[PDB]
Structures are given as structure tokens and as C-alpha cells.
């Protein structure tokens, strides 16, 4: 069975696997440890970006508001923001950079605009997500310590909320569309869920990775002849210095969309 294949995959991998697939044709679900908490790592960046889009629903100048990038703002891994030191980036550009390149400076600028991590949590609560919590900024939100509740969610909660954000009621249409456009242009996910799927399918996703070999991907999937699928694959391991395992996420994607 699908359940037996995921269990064997997890055993042989040496870690803990969390999967939630929602089939929007009939709201059927494939769940594996989907009520267990996992460290989100950079998959939390979707919530911070969405929180800014929500603000833009009532303020038509917000996304084009300029933000100055100073050398001191830079943290670790800054592929887009480092290209703009002593210049500016708009809030829209920072959302794009946070999502499509997983820029960490971009994420911190979004959090600071919103007023801190607790405002990202409050936004999640406003969508009906009672599980998501963001506690820290970059880079420390990726420590992914086993049993640590900070900066965690569950696979099912994140799958439900990702569906609401991209396909459902959470955002007005223009903002929903802008979020989907960003996810579809992600550059970081080619070896994760996407690699387990037919090459013709269209995918929007956001990866995450952290310590304890924590390796994550969340995706919206548009088949060519079927209703969309939403898939969350979270994976973490017991040793702090474990290698990340994007191949495990690809394998899990292949198992749960078979037939």
C-alpha cells in the first residue's frame, strides 16, 4: 500500500518523514505523520510573503514601497539582496526574492515590516491555522532541534493552509494570483517534489532546509487533465550534521501520486 511504501522509505532513510497530500477533486487525503510537528525552515517564507499580500488588499501603494538594503542587513545566504546593497528593493521584489531564491535578508525585511515573527503567527491564525508558529528570524529559525516547538507546523496544517492561500479563500484574486506566480517561478526545487512528478505537470513550490538534515518542500501541483493537488513533504533526521535528502522528498512524491 501507499502507507507501507512510505513506512519502508522512512525506515531505510534513517529519519522521520511527514507527508500530506490533498486531492482537490474530492478533498481526499493521503496522510503520513501529518499531525506531527516539523521545523518549517524556509517553507515559513510563504506565510510572511502572504501576510504582506494581505496588507496590499487594503493599501494600493504597499507592494511598490521601497526598502533600503544596507550591508549590515545582510545575514547568511543573500543571493538577491547582495546585488542591491546601498540601493533599494520594493516589498514585491523582496517577496519574490524570499520565495524564488530563498533569500534570507528578504525574509527578515518582510518580518521587520510586519512587526516581528509574532505578526506572521497572528496572520496564520486569521486564516484558521491554529498550528503554525513563527518564533525566530533568519538564520536561527532553521536550527530544527528535535522536540523544539519553535518555528514548527504539521504537514496537514501546512497543506490545508497552502491550499487556502493558492486555490481558496484566504487572499483576494489579484493577491492569490501573485502568490501563485511567485511559487511557479521558484528556482530551488528541481531535485525535490518536482523530480518525482511527470515532467509535463506544472508545479509551484517552496523548499526548506536546516540542521538535523531537515529537508522540506511544499507544492501546489496542476496536472494536465485533473484538478490540482497540494503536497507537503517534510523530513528530518536525528544527527545535527546529517546531510539533507532532497531525493527522499522526490521519492515520497512519486509514491503518493502513483496512479
Amino acid at each position: 500500500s501507499v502507507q507501507q511504501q512510505l513506512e519502508a522509505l522512512e525506515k531505510s532513510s534513517g529519519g522521520r518523514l511527514g507527508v500530506a497530500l490533498i486531492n482537490t477533486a474530492d478533498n481526499s487525503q493521503i496522510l503520513y505523520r501529518a499531525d506531527e510537528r516539523f521545523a518549517m525552515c524556509a517553507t515559513s517564507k510563504v506565510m510572511a510573503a502572504a501576510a504582506v499580500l494581505k496588507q496590499s488588499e487594503s493599501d494600493k501603494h504597499l507592494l511598490n514601497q521601497r526598502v533600503e538594503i544596507k550591508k549590515s542587513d545582510l545575514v547568511n545566504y543573500n543571493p538577491i539582496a547582495e546585488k542591491h546593497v546601498n540601493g533599494t528593493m520594493t516589498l514585491a521584489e523582496l517577496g519574490a526574492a524570499a520565495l524564488q531564491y530563498s533569500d534570507n535578508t528578504a525574509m527578515n525585511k518582510l518580518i521587520a515590516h510586519l512587526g516581528g515573527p509574532d505578526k506572521v503567527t497572528a496572520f496564520a491564525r486569521s486564516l484558521g491555522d491554529e498550528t503554525f508558529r513563527l518564533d525566530r528570524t533568519e538564520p536561527t529559525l532553521n536550527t530544527a532541534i528535535p522536540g523544539d516547538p519553535r518555528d514548527t507546523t504539521t504537514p496537514l496544517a501546512m497543506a490545508q493552509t497552502l491550499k487556502n492561500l493558492t486555490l481558496g479563500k484566504a487572499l483576494a484574486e489579484t493577491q492569490r494570483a501573485q502568490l501563485v506566480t511567485w511559487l511557479k517561478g521558484n528556482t530551488t526545487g528541481s531535485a525535490s517534489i518536482r523530480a518525482g512528478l511527470p515532467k509535463s505537470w506544472v508545479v509551484g513550490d517552496k523548499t526548506g532546509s536546516g540542521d538535523y538534515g531537515t529537508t522540506n518542500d511544499i507544492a501546489v501541483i496542476w496536472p494536465e487533465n485533473h484538478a490540482p493537488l497540494v503536497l507537503v513533504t517534510y523530513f528530518t533526521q536525528p544527527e545535527q550534521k546529517a546531510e539533507n535528502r532532497n531525493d527522499i522528498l522526490a521519492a515520497a512524491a512519486k509514491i503518493v501520486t502513483h496512479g
Side-chain angles (χ1 to χ4, degrees):
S1 62
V2 171
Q3 287 294 324
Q4 170 173 322
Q5 290 173 72
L6 293 174
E7 209 186 19
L9 181 61
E10 180 183 55
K11 203 155 151 58
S12 284
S13 72
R16 181 167 65 97
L17 179 67
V19 177
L21 174 85
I22 297 173
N23 184 335
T24 65
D26 53 6
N27 294 272
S28 67
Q29 303 178 341
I30 300 171
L31 305 179
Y32 189 90
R33 301 196 195 279
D35 293 314
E36 299 187 17
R37 283 184 177 275
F38 297 72
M40 291 176 286
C41 301
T43 66
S44 65
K45 293 189 184 175
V46 171
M47 192 77 64
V52 174
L53 291 171
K54 172 59 66 183
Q55 295 181 316
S56 76
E57 288 178 24
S58 60
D59 172 4
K60 277 56 146 174
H61 302 298
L62 183 65
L63 292 180
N64 285 104
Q65 179 184 303
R66 297 208 114 85
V67 178
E68 307 180 0
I69 310 303
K70 302 301 188 201
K71 77 302 176 170
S72 65
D73 294 329
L74 301 173
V75 287
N76 68 321
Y77 190 65
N78 325 295
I80 307 299
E82 73 180 337
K83 297 185 156 240
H84 294 92
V85 183
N86 321 305
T88 63
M89 296 174 69
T90 66
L91 282 174
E93 288 169 354
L94 290 156
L99 295 186
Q100 299 186 324
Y101 292 89
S102 206
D103 189 295
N104 276 353
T105 296
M107 170 63 149
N108 282 356
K109 292 314 220 165
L110 302 167
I111 292 166
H113 167 72
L114 293 163
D118 54 280
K119 307 293 191 280
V120 187
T121 304
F123 173 67
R125 295 288 181 271
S126 78
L127 302 192
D129 186 327
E130 60 202 312
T131 305
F132 175 103
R133 55 181 287 180
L134 194 71
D135 295 272
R136 289 167 298 170
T137 62
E138 299 285 0
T140 62
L141 66 84
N142 309 286
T143 50
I145 301 159
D148 188 344
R150 291 178 296 172
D151 311 291
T152 58
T153 194
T154 64
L156 177 60
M158 190 61 116
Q160 295 168 330
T161 293
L162 187 61
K163 180 187 154 255
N164 284 348
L165 282 168
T166 59
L167 299 166
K169 44 173 169 58
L171 300 171
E173 172 58 28
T174 295
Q175 282 75 22
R176 181 198 76 71
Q178 176 67 261
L179 182 59
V180 168
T181 292
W182 282 340
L183 292 171
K184 285 179 166 180
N186 184 35
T187 73
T188 66
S190 298
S192 301
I193 285 164
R194 288 166 194 261
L197 303 182
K199 299 170 196 170
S200 70
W201 287 7
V202 171
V203 178
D205 82 296
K206 179 75 194 80
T207 51
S209 45
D211 288 342
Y212 292 84
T214 300
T215 317
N216 296 335
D217 201 14
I218 68 180
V220 180
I221 301 162
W222 290 265
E224 286 285 343
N225 301 303
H226 288 85
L229 314 171
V230 178
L231 171 66
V232 169
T233 57
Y234 279 174
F235 180 69
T236 192
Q237 295 170 78
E239 66 269 45
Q240 186 179 14
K241 284 308 232 140
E243 70 171 326
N244 297 281
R245 295 293 308 276
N246 287 285
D247 61 320
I248 296 296
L249 309 188
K254 185 175 193 180
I255 289 166
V256 305
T257 63
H258 182 39

